[PDB]
Amino acid sequence: RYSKISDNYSSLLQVSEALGRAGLESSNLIVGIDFTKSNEWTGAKSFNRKSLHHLSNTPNPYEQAITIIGRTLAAFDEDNLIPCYGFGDASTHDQDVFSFYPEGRFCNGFEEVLARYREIVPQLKLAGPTSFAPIIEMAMTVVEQSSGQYHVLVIIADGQVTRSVDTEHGRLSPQEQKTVDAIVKASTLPLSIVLVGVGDGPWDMMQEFADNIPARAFDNFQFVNFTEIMSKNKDQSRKETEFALSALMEIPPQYKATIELNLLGVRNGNIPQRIPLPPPVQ
Ligand SMILES: [Mg+2]
Ligand SMILES: [Mg+2]
């Protein structure tokens, strides 16, 4: 379905224009980056056996994903301030996020996101396990503190939420419990959540995962497999529009739903204030 749409899109400008015509207005971008140790080996097939966070003269999947989404959403934020966080390194595990800059200062444009990313990466101790509760709660806090301005949180991760050892008997892990709770609670705010999967995964359980999130006032969650799209036999420009469309096509209807539900522009009042840790660098 997204492949059919993308056959008519040769540039990310066209995709931005389409989001606008579909009714997307002012949108702020929030980025969260997975810094788990698994990144070392999930690039087996998808990244020629290199770490997903390997730095070189060609962008790694994190840099690519940031670049495509950042470029596509740029038109919807006049000054492109991007709150950016890491999670899953030794300083945060599954409990916290850290801000890219001290005192939680926002990045000025995706270009600075990318530059700061490259500075931080070699200084991190990669760890785990995997929960998206902290990054989503951080996004919730930013949205509340902005007085209900519309935000898109983009999480780029190399694995599904950590499961229980006893998942076969229906047991959820605390990572799953807290992440699903956060997704549901986030739907009380004008916030869209896009989970971008990079690396080899596996990612086969994601559509079932999304299908099983409890009922919400609007569907505020999307998963997109960057790896699968970017592995296809298309021109580079057309793989990028397909990825941008698969990640962001559902954002204009979600935006319109936040207006219909009168979430836009107001404080919910029941959002605990998550504090981002400092970047574990120097
Ligand atoms: Mg991982
Ligand atoms: Mg702005």
From Swiss-Prot:
Its EC number is 2.3.2.27. Ubiquitously expressed. One of its GO terms (cellular component) is plasma membrane. GO terms for biological process: abscisic acid-activated signaling pathway; negative regulation of response to water deprivation; positive regulation of abscisic acid-activated signaling pathway; protein K63-linked ubiquitination. It comes from the Eukaryota. It is found in: Cell membrane; Nucleus. It catalyses: S-ubiquitinyl-[E2 ubiquitin-conjugating enzyme]-L-cysteine + [acceptor protein]-L-lysine = [E2 ubiquitin-conjugating enzyme]-L-cysteine + N(6)-ubiquitinyl-[acceptor protein]-L-lysine. Disruption phenotype: No visible phenotype; due to the redundancy with RGLG2. Rglg1 and rglg2 double mutants show a complete loss of apical dominance. The double mutant seedlings rglg1 and rglg2 exhibit a dehydration-tolerant phenotype. Keywords: Abscisic acid signaling pathway, Cell membrane, Lipoprotein, Membrane, Metal-binding, Myristate, Nucleus, Stress response, Transferase, Ubl conjugation pathway, Zinc, Zinc-finger. It is a lipid-anchor. Its main location: membrane. GO terms for molecular function: ubiquitin protein ligase activity; ubiquitin-protein transferase activity; zinc ion binding. It is an enzyme of class 2 (transferase). E3 ubiquitin-protein ligase that mediates the formation of 'Lys-63'-linked ubiquitin chains. Regulates apical dominance by acting on the auxin transport proteins abundance. Together with RGLG5, mediates the ubiquitination and subsequent proteasomal degradation of the target protein PP2CA. Functions as a positive regulator of abscisic acid (ABA) signaling through ABA-dependent degradation of PP2CA, a major inhibitor of ABA signaling. Acts as a negative regulator of drought stress response. This is E3 ubiquitin-protein ligase RGLG1. It comes from Arabidopsis thaliana. The lineage of its organism: Eukaryota, Viridiplantae, Streptophyta, Embryophyta, Tracheophyta.
